[PDB]
Design a protein around this ligand. Structure first.
Ligand SMILES: Nc1ncnc2c1ncn2[C@@H]1O[C@H](COP(=O)(O)OP(=O)(O)O)[C@@H](O)[C@H]1O
Ligand SMILES: [Mg+2]
Ligand SMILES: [Mg+2]
Ligand code: NA
Lengths: 313, 342
């Protein structure tokens, strides 16, 4: 007769949630907070229940972009340039303006040579160059305005601390956006960030997402200081069950670190939900030893069942 | 709006009836609906050169099409006027237009519609002075060596990732270079060069006649571009559109079974194409092979367009790209399998 009592080995926030969740014997039927879900296979209930868990527990539910909103989000960014390394494939020489063919990590691109920043002069093809590329990238992330930080991200990339801001609506987003960017710069943070650029999809708990690299503590402290002012007025107070709350509508976690070949390109929220769905299904396919099935699935996916916002070392 | 109204006024069409106008799709701003004089029009605007090579090519088609019998499987809606300086064209509206993309999703682009489409394209390719002889930028060979930075800032993470996979596939890039090189070694024909299902429209909610539209890329060019595009559209419908996690082998198995069930659609098109262009293989024996190679590229093309709304490439995308690679690097076998032989 405590949710922690019946769900030992699991973070309390998660134990509380699993009381809104049941899977029928045989795993052809499940129920997430009145959101019933059915399938004809155990295997298809895995994908549907994952979705129901993701909506109810991570996102909290149950087309185009906007040039006005984008213009205001674009203006809020405190910088305009992110230096970027890649290997010079070839200097192209034009009278209308010389150009550099550069292998960036994500693509081979044809860059104006006026963007070179190091070396001071186009080197031989094969030499690392460094280029002043726009910080803002409004098409990169569909549904979102994306910005890279002024300071280049570490080479091994490393573990990425995610921070989610539950903007209530577009106006709050602009303010939270600006405050968070101001804060992260001043703190010399290594990050990318993005904010919803579609005014008809607020509220969302991930209306703003910050990706902090290197040492996240300075930038997290800075952001928490900068936004706690607004936290509950501009941010709705609810957050994902899988995250560590830092304040009303301000939540944090790490990018999944699943050491299983098949698991990749999965968001934090989709990954946690999938692990949870699997454990819940494996449970239903026998006959609480239910919490153990859930605990096993989280651990196999690399999630710390006591702190699921974190991964195992 | 001003430049459009100016043209409607001068043609005797009055103005666009804002109460009944409606925007249609494509990379251009388009308007359709009734004018204050009651006439139904389709208006297209194209951004001029800082005129407008896409409208000059579209008009070069309308000039050829006006000298055609009303029995031609190839029909224009009817050009009402144009202002190429201002980037504006006006055509007769086709009442209750359903696009070939809608028909294919609904299950209505059947074998017999595919045959009429082949007849239209075969008719096209028979018809050449005053055709742009410049090469169509598809496949985009400069982009396969390096995307312009301005293009990267307008693409999704998945489109960029798809570009990168193509750029680093040396065999694919070399095959696409060979494919474009061959265009100056074959008998050319009047060609749309931008053919997809959404460039076809059928009147009367799908019960009317068949039009092929969007002649912005109309050129004297390799006929294989249009045949390949039609095959590639079916390829892409069968191995991607209908599927939108299994194993990769299961995605491949489903995709393969789905393609086989759709091969008659490509067969009908090629039947129809030969009905109206019976001398095709006599002049170009390589046409099946080249068509299959364009069908391969067309899948990459369609997969890169579809990714604009995604942040990662899903496993179906990747499986479909794998089929595209197989058709491109093995064009003689894909031609036979696709039914483009004899
Ligand atoms: N005359 C017309 N009557 C009805 N619908 C049309 C007509 N012309 C074009 N459309 C529809 O509008 C769409 C856009 O036309 P299109 O010429 O392809 O423009 P874009 O160059 O922007 O692709 C077509 O795909 C077709 O579905
Ligand atoms: Mg079009
Ligand atoms: Mg067009
Ligand atoms: Na189909």
């Amino acid at each position: 007769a405590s949710p922690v009592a019946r769900h030992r080995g699991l973070a309390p926030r998660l134990a509380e949630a699993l009381d809104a969740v049941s899977v029928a014997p045989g795993a052809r039927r499940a129920s997430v907070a009145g959101r019933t879900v059915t399938a004809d296979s155990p295997r298809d209930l895995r994908g549907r229940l994952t979705n129901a868990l993701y909506e109810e527990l991570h996102a909290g539910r149950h087309t185009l972009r906007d040039p006005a909103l984008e213009a205001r989000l674009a203006a809020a960014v405190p910088h305009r340039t992110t230096p970027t390394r890649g290997r010079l494939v070839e200097v192209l020489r034009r009278p209308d303006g010389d150009q550099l063919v550069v292998r960036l990590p994500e693509v081979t691109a044809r860059v104006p040579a006026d963007r070179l920043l190091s070396p001071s002069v186009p080197p031989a093809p094969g030499e690392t160059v460094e280029l002043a590329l726009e910080a803002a990238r409004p098409a990169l992330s569909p549904g979102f305005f994306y910005v890279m930080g002024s300071r280049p991200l570490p080479r091994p990339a490393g573990a990425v601390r995610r921070i989610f801001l539950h903007a209530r609506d577009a106006d709050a987003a602009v303010v939270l956006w600006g405050a968070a960017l101001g804060a992260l710069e001043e703190a010399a943070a290594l990050y990318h960030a993005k904010v919803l650029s579609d005014p008809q999809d607020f509220p969302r708990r991930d209306a703003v997402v910050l990706y902090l690299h290197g040492d996240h503590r300075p930038g997290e402290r800075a952001v928490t200081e900068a936004v706690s002012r607004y936290a509950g007025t501009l941010t709705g107070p609810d957050t994902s069950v899988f995250t560590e709350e830092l304040a009303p509508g301000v939540a944090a976690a790490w990018d999944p670190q699943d050491p299983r070949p098949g698991q990749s390109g999965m968001s934090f929220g989709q990954h946690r939900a999938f692990a949870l769905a699997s454990g819940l299904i494996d449970c239903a396919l026998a006959d609480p030893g239910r919490a153990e099935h859930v605990v096993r699935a989280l651990r196999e996916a690399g999630i710390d069942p006591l702190h699921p916002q974190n991964n195992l070392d | 709006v001003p430049a459009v109204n100016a043209l409607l006024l001068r043609l005797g069409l009055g103005r666009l009836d804002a109460a009944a106008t409606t925007a249609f799709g494509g990379r251009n701003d388009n308007w359709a609906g009734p004018t204050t004089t009651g006439e139904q029009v389709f208006v297209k605007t194209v951004t001029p050169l800082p005129g407008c090579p896409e409208l000059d090519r579209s008009l070069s088609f309308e000039d050829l099409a006006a000298r055609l019998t009303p029995a031609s499987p190839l029909r224009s809606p009817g050009l009402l006027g144009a202002d190429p300086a201002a980037g504006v064209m006006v055509h007769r509206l086709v009442p209750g237009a359903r696009s070939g993309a809608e028909l294919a999703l609904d299950g209505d682009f059947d074998d017999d519609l595919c045959r009429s489409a082949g007849r239209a394209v075969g008719t096209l390719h028979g018809l050449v002075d005053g055709l742009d002889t410049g090469e169509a930028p598809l496949p985009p060979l400069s982009w396969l060596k390096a995307l312009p930075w301005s293009a990267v800032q307008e693409r999704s993470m998945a489109q960029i990732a798809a570009w990168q996979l193509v750029q680093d596939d040396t065999e694919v890039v070399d095959a696409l270079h060979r494919l474009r090189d061959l265009e100056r070694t074959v008998p050319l024909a009047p060609a749309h060069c931008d053919l997809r299902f959404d460039q076809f429209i059928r009147a009367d909610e799908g019960a009317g006649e068949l039009y092929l539209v969007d002649w912005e890329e109309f050129r004297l060019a390799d006929p294989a571009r249009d045949v390949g595009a039609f095959a590639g559209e079916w390829l892409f419908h069968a191995t991607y559109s209908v599927f939108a996690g299994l194993t990769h082998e299961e995605i491949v198995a489903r995709g393969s079974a789905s393609l086989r069930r759709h091969l008659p659609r490509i067969a009908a098109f090629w039947q129809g194409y030969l009905e109206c262009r019976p001398q095709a293989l006599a002049l170009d024996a390589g046409l099946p092979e080249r068509a299959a190679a364009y069908a391969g590229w067309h899948m990459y093309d369609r997969l890169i367009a579809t990714a604009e709304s995604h942040a990662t490439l899903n496993p179906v995308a990747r499986a479909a790209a794998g089929i595209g690679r197989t058709v491109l690097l093995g064009p003689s076998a894909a031609a036979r399998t696709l039914g483009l032989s004899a």
